[PDB]
């Protein structure tokens, strides 16, 4: 039995490609005339991100990255 | 203390090399930092974005952290240790750090006396 080749199907499931967003740091805080700090979404409750992490304002939920925490 | 207060960051960024304590990079650098759980924080003057001064320094200013200021982001990338060397010891490679926090310090005489001496006299 010599191995048959046949590769077609679906031509192309294309894999996720990593949006690279430039300096997405910077949207987080905003700063006013005096160089006070607002933050302007929420902070996430659990332990390991506690304090050094933040949520994610989607339209219907809240979603830190880390223990993949939501909210409505 | 012998030392001139330029060159003497080389001991405090060594030991916080060594004892696994530094944070870099800038989302790495602030977030950890204003966790209250890291002392001190370097970083550059020379650099392309203007709200990049105003993040750090607001998140020094109302967080208790002190600001030290170098040149160019290459010299902090060669006290960073990110810079790969040649055969014979050329630094040959460069990825600059603007943004560096401490957590855990080494024990030194020697970077703390020229950090707690520039810092007495800043106050
Ligand atoms: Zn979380």
């Known amino acids: 039995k010599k191995r048959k080749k046949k ?7 294309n894999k996720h490609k990593r949006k690279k967003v430039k300096l997405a740091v910077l949207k987080y805080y905003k700063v006013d005339e005096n160089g006070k700090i607002s933050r302007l979404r929420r ?3 659990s332990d390991e991100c506690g304090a050094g992490v ?19 | 203390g012998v030392m001139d207060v330029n060159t003497a960051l080389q001991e405090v960024l060594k030991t916080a090399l060594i004892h696994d304590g530094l944070a870099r990079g800038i989302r790495e650098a602030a977030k950890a930092l204003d966790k ?20 750090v320094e ?17 010299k902090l990338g060669e006290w960073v240790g990110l810079c790969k060397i040649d055969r014979e010891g050329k630094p040959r ?13 080494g024990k030194e005489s020697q970077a703390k006396d020229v950090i707690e001496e520039y810092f007495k006299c800043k106050k």
Not at chain 1, 7 to 13: A, F, I, R
């Open chain 1, 7 to 13: 590769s077609c199907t679906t031509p192309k499931k």
């Open chain 1, 43 to 45: 902070e996430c409750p």
């Open chain 1, 54 to 72: 933040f949520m994610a304002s989607h339209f219907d939920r809240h979603y830190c990255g880390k223990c993949c925490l939501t909210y409505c």
């Open chain 2, 36 to 55: 209250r759980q890291a002392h001190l924080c370097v970083l550059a003057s020379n650099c392309d974005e203007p709200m990049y001064v105003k993040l």
């Open chain 2, 58 to 74: 607001a998140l020094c200013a109302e967080h208790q952290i002190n600001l030290i200021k170098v040149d160019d982001n290459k």
């Open chain 2, 93 to 105: 490679k460069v990825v600059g750090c603007s943004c560096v926090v401490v957590k855990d310090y």
